Amino acid sequence: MESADLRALAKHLYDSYIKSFPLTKAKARAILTGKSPFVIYDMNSLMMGEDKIKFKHIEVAIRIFQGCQFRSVEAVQEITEYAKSIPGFVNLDLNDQVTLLKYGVHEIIYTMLASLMNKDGVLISEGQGFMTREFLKSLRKPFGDFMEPKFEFAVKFNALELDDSDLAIFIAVIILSGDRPGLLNVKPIEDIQDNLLQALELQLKLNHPESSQLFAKLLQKMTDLRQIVTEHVQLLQVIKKTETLHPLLQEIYKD
Amino acid sequence: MESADLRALAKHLYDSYIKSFPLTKAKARAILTGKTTDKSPFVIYDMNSLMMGEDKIKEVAIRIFQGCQFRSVEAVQEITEYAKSIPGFVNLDLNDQVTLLKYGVHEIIYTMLASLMNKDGVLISEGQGFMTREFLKSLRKPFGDFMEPKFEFAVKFNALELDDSDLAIFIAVIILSGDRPGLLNVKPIEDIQDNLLQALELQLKLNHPESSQLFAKLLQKMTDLRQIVTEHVQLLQVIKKTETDMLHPLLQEIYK
Numbered sequence A: 001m002e003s004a005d006l007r008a009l010a011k012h013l014y015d016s017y018i019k020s021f022p023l024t025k026a027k028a029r030a031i032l033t034g035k036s037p038f039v040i041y042d043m044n045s046l047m048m049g050e051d052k053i054k055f056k057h058i059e060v061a062i063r064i065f066q067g068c069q070f071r072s073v074e075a076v077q078e079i080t081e082y083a084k085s086i087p088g089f090v091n092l093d094l095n096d097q098v099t100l101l102k103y104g105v106h107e108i109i110y111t112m113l114a115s116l117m118n119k120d121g122v123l124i125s126e127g128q129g130f131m132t133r134e135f136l137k138s139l140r141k142p143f144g145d146f147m148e149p150k151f152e153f154a155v156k157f158n159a160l161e162l163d164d165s166d167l168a169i170f171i172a173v174i175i176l177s178g179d180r181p182g183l184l185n186v187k188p189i190e191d192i193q194d195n196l197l198q199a200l201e202l203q204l205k206l207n208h209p210e211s212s213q214l215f216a217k218l219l220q221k222m223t224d225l226r227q228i229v230t231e232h233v234q235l236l237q238v239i240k241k242t243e244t245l246h247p248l249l250q251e252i253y254k255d
Numbered sequence B: 001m002e003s004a005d006l007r008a009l010a011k012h013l014y015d016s017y018i019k020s021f022p023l024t025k026a027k028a029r030a031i032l033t034g035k036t037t038d039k040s041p042f043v044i045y046d047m048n049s050l051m052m053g054e055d056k057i058k059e060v061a062i063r064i065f066q067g068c069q070f071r072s073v074e075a076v077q078e079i080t081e082y083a084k085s086i087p088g089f090v091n092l093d094l095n096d097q098v099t100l101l102k103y104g105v106h107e108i109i110y111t112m113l114a115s116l117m118n119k120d121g122v123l124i125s126e127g128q129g130f131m132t133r134e135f136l137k138s139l140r141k142p143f144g145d146f147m148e149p150k151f152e153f154a155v156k157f158n159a160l161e162l163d164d165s166d167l168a169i170f171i172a173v174i175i176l177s178g179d180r181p182g183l184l185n186v187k188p189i190e191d192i193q194d195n196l197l198q199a200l201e202l203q204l205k206l207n208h209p210e211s212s213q214l215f216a217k218l219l220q221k222m223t224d225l226r227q228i229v230t231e232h233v234q235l236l237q238v239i240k241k242t243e244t245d246m247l248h249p250l251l252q253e254i255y256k
């Protein structure tokens, strides 16, 4: 509705995003730009890194892969809590709430991973570690090709130069997608997303006055996310199908 | 912890329990206590009705036993999804997550099995069926003694008259037990349980105001289940020594 109302909606989402996510993009950027993390750049520094920082995840490539999984499962919970703060979400049909989270979390994880990345690597363990891109890119069998597309996405995504207040609204828009399979009541979902989209458009105008058609460009990225997530789940399928784990542990990571 | 925060924890757990478990106690009671033309189960009380039931919905004792196992495996899956929603669980050491599930799932299954039960039998196939206590109690060799202790517990547990919003918190409390064998970091688990216990205590006072010392009574039940689970695995052990030709990989790993 009114501009005052969209601004209030943007502020509400920002305040909630700050409480929901441990490491903001602003904090990550301060770290990546040297403005201090333990650096993992090869096999020996990896072994020291587990010695040094307290990894809760514990072949080298598998351990790293298991580390991605562990953090993603935490991210899913963090995003799930975030969604409850999106005005109207908790009033949706419970099955639709589940459906929106089920298909949304992977796109949001990918999006938010870009905040922890630059062209040279990725922050881990709330910023205590930094794993270099070239070291990840050089892992064996399929694992190297599993890590690198995330960086290829993140470098393009980061050229938009979004900040946390932009991302708080963007994340909400992805959750409130009325085309997820199996939704029971599309209408209030699109009505919410319509509101979030108005708030994002106003947010990008005020926060990036010089950035022409940034709204449109961000929407284009949101579409990309669908196919890159689909290729991700396909690679996830094969790595799980070949490189075997306890049944209880496998059940934790089934989703 | 502040009341508003404990109430918020109760709503989060209740909402997540509804999302993770397809047949709630509220639905089970609606089916069992009827009033219904649409929710009424087909009743299995003997061999003939069993054979008709398969039409409607490998000695009987084995078929029934494998039917439990399949369902118990699904329950494990449901319980694992539930646990991931308990605030703080997925942030624990991965080995401890596995350990909490390994020792927790059986106690929760029995707990939730009570919801599908009355003194006369148990709902099956998401409530389409109802198998009588006496028919199970009469199965052969050890299988007859295998079903009956579930009923003995359930009759005592159901007298507490808990509803699903209570059970959601109770179930979480069970998972977050810092005394499971082999845990590496007891303290953060105990810290989660402290909050869950505070939340259970407020939930039970508000939701059962006239039910004196229900918190204490509910905790006493949580201890029993530990031995009731032991009697189950001790029975299970013998079946393995007897029925050499028969467990799901998930159930196999949970045991030992």
Ligand SMILES: COc1cc(COc2cc(C(=O)O)ccc2-c2nn(C(=O)c3c(Cl)cccc3C(F)(F)F)c3ccc(Cl)cc23)cc(OC)c1
Binding pocket: A055, A057, A064, A065, A067, A068, A069, A070, A071, A072, A073, A075, A106, A109, A110, A112, A113, A116, A122, A123, A124, A125, A131, A136, A146, A147, A150, A236
């Ligand atoms: C402790 O040890 C570590 C820790 C990490 C940290 O990673 C991440 C951190 C965050 C965060 O904090 O917000 C978010 C996503 C990742 C990550 N996920 N991932 C997947 O594959 C993935 C994705 Cl995108 C989406 C859904 C599911 C999955 C998964 F389930 F299948 F995992 C990555 C692949 C490559 C990279 Cl570089 C990062 C991620 C990374 C690490 O090694 C690189 C080791």
Ligand SMILES: COc1cc(COc2cc(C(=O)O)ccc2-c2nn(C(=O)c3c(Cl)cccc3C(F)(F)F)c3ccc(Cl)cc23)cc(OC)c1
Binding pocket: B064, B065, B067, B068, B069, B070, B071, B072, B075, B106, B109, B110, B112, B113, B116, B122, B123, B124, B125, B131, B136, B146, B147, B150, B251
């Ligand atoms: C479709 O066909 C059916 C279906 C059932 C349905 O049962 C159950 C349903 C549920 C549920 O839906 O949440 C939960 C537990 C049981 C059940 N398990 N069980 C075991 O023994 C057992 C247990 Cl507890 C734990 C681990 C492993 C096992 C097992 F692997 F070793 F089995 C029971 C023993 C007696 C009773 Cl009465 C119920 C259960 C029951 C049925 O016959 C009774 C036939």
